[PDB]
């Protein structure tokens, strides 16, 4: 009940955080100004937060085991302490004392903290040169953006795979194949079912000895240092917590700076004028290593600039 989440004795963490958080109880008032600042409201929210922050996750969790069976072998990385925040922009605020002011990303069914696959895909793509859209507003920073990111991608690819030299067009084609599953343009490559890159949801895997959710403060001091600060309390994923990243990655075949299908590359290999110098191959394992390096570099979640969401190898 209080710890060891499981599936038989637990309260849905998202339910507790969003729907059951502001339940109306006798003698508890937070409609009036006096009620929102009262100690009774603070005690009520303290008890709710203590209920939220009391659950642990075992390594042999049937939930996590089912996730592993469905989505394959995970990439296990461990949280370091600033904490980890996801879904910070979700509205969760009334104006009371002792309540969680920022939002949190909970799975609806399981209730476990998780990172949506869209978040992981966007975070990984942001470190690739062609993530920024060529637009009127972005055209000022567009050249520097791609110039800076292309070098980073080049060194990372040379590190993770045996390719000695990679061109800018090759990097563009690889990025558009991994994330867009197309060519740099609008053209579609005839890909097989397994030749698709899928970014599943990252789930909290195992809190070894301790809870997985903790409370943290950000206390902005305004532009006037003579005025009072503003304590903002939010919910974070505790440090030393294992995060399971699930991917479905394939092998990318590059021939003459263009992305080729597996059968296409077989036919190209069978031809007489096959230049092995123009053939490049990045496997699923090397793609996973590339993504792992990106994640260890920048991290994932909210407030990543001020440290939150940084990962270490398990």
């Amino acid at each position: 009940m209080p710890k060891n989440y499981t599936l038989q004795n637990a309260s849905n963490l998202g339910w507790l955080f969003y729907k059951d958080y502001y339940r109306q109880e006798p003698n508890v008032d937070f409609i009036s100004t006096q009620g929102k600042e009262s100690d009774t409201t603070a005690d009520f929210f303290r008890k709710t937060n203590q209920r939220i922050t009391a659950y642990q996750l075992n390594s042999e969790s049937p939930l996590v085991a089912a996730f592993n069976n469905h989505f394959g072998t995970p990439l296990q990385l461990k949280t370091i302490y600033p904490g980890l925040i996801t879904g910070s922009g979700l509205p969760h605020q009334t104006g009371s004392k002792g309540e969680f002011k920022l939002g949190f990303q909970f799975d609806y069914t399981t209730g476990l903290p998780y990172i949506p696959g869209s978040s992981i895909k966007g975070t990984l793509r942001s470190m690739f040169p062609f993530s920024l859209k060529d637009k009127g507003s972005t055209k000022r920073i567009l050249p520097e953006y791609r110039k800076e990111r292309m070098e980073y991608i080049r060194d990372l690819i040379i590190e993770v795979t045996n390719i000695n030299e990679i061109s800018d067009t090759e990097i563009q084609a690889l990025e558009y194949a991994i994330f867009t599953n197309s060519t740099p343009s609008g053209k579609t490559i005839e890909f097989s079912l397994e030749e698709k890159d899928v970014f599943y949801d990252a789930f909290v895997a195992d809190s070894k000895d301790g809870v997985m959710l903790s409370d943290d403060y950000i206390t902005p001091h305004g532009e006037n240092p003579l005025k009072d600060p503003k304590p903002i309390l939010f919910l974070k994923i505790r440090p030393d917590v294992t995060i399971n990243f699930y991917f479905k990655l394939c092998t990318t075949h590059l021939y003459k700076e263009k992305v080729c299908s597996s059968k296409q590359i077989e036919e190209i290999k069978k031809q007489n004028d096959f230049s092995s110098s123009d053939y490049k191959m990045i496997t699923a394992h090397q793609k996973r290593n590339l993504f792992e390096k990106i994640l260890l570099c920048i991290g994932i979640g909210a407030k990543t600039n001020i440290g939150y969401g940084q990962l270490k190898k398990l």
Partner: protein, 279 residues
């Protein structure tokens, strides 16, 4: 032989977009049934996803699904795909993480569909489901109800403080019905299930578009919760026996995972398709 009922078990948050414009909070809504207003999959989307899965076997696709678009020889498909209707939806609770929620009207619709379509193993299922529905109606006596069949789930809050679970000791739940509908099953009234499945209560996922780390766009996407169960009817339209056997073997293999809906790259609509087990 001709008609079989297949159950869809979703492994992630699934989104089959209706494509209509909503000028409220949720910009992208999911497909809903034209009659019952419950979340569903269009038979066109189901057929397209399953054809995409089997695309490698050109002969099997040509015999079962038909000819590819704009082929010189347009030959009709033999297997008929029926739309998938919502069977069970997970609901958040305080006693357990989630519960399997089904309404009495969903049960009645399933019974009527099995009666009309004459599934392979429909007789025992219809008998037992009719008995269960009759017991539920006798116990409810016209009022709103939330009936669980596990004594430990008494007093559970089904996603709303109003909805509380009571355990009727008289009504039995057969193990095959538990396997079909799901563990930790709660039978809800039509009002309760409609409230729990409407647009104000279905899960929504918030997404934003970042340009150089700065938010450019922002929208909300409605999703069907993970581990939801949907049933659809497969009709064997005089298709060849060996291709049919391969189709059902691959479809019902435990290792087989099929993507249905939108947002495939970010892992949304991944499901497992199961056949109606004999009672």
């Amino acid at each position: 032989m001709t008609t079989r009922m297949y159950v869809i078990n979703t492994l992630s948050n699934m989104h089959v977009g209706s494509g209509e414009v909503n000028y409220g909070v949720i910009a992208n809504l999911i497909q809903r049934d034209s009659v019952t207003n419950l979340p569903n999959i269009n038979s066109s989307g189901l057929k397209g996803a399953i054809r995409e899965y089997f695309k490698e076997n050109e002969d099997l696709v040509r015999e079962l699904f038909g000819s590819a678009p704009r082929d010189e020889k347009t030959l009709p498909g033999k297997v008929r795909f029926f739309e998938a209707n919502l069977l069970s939806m997970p609901v958040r609770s305080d006693k357990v993480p989630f519960l399997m929620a089904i309404s009495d009207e969903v049960l009645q619709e399933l019974i009527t569909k099995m009666k009309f379509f004459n599934c392979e193993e429909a007789t025992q299922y219809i008998s037992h489901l009719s008995t269960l529905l009759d017991n539920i109606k006798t116990q409810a006596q016209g009022t709103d109800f939330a009936y669980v069949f596990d004594p430990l789930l008494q007093g559970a809050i089904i996603e709303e403080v109003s909805i509380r679970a009571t355990c009727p000791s008289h009504i039995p739940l057969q193990p095959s019905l538990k396997k079909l509908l799901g563990d930790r099953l709660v039978i809800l009234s039509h009002k309760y299930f409609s409230i729990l499945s409407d647009d104000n209560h279905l899960p929504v996922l918030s997404r934003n578009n970042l340009e150089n780390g700065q938010s450019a766009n922002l929208w909300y996407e409605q999703v069907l919760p993970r581990y939801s169960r949907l049933y659809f009817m497969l009709m064997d339209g005089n298709a060849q026996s060996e291709y049919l056997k391969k189709f059902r073997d691959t479809l019902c293999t435990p290792s087989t995972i099929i993507q249905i809906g939108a947002n495939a790259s970010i892992g949304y609509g991944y499901c497992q398709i199961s056949e109606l087990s004999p009672f």
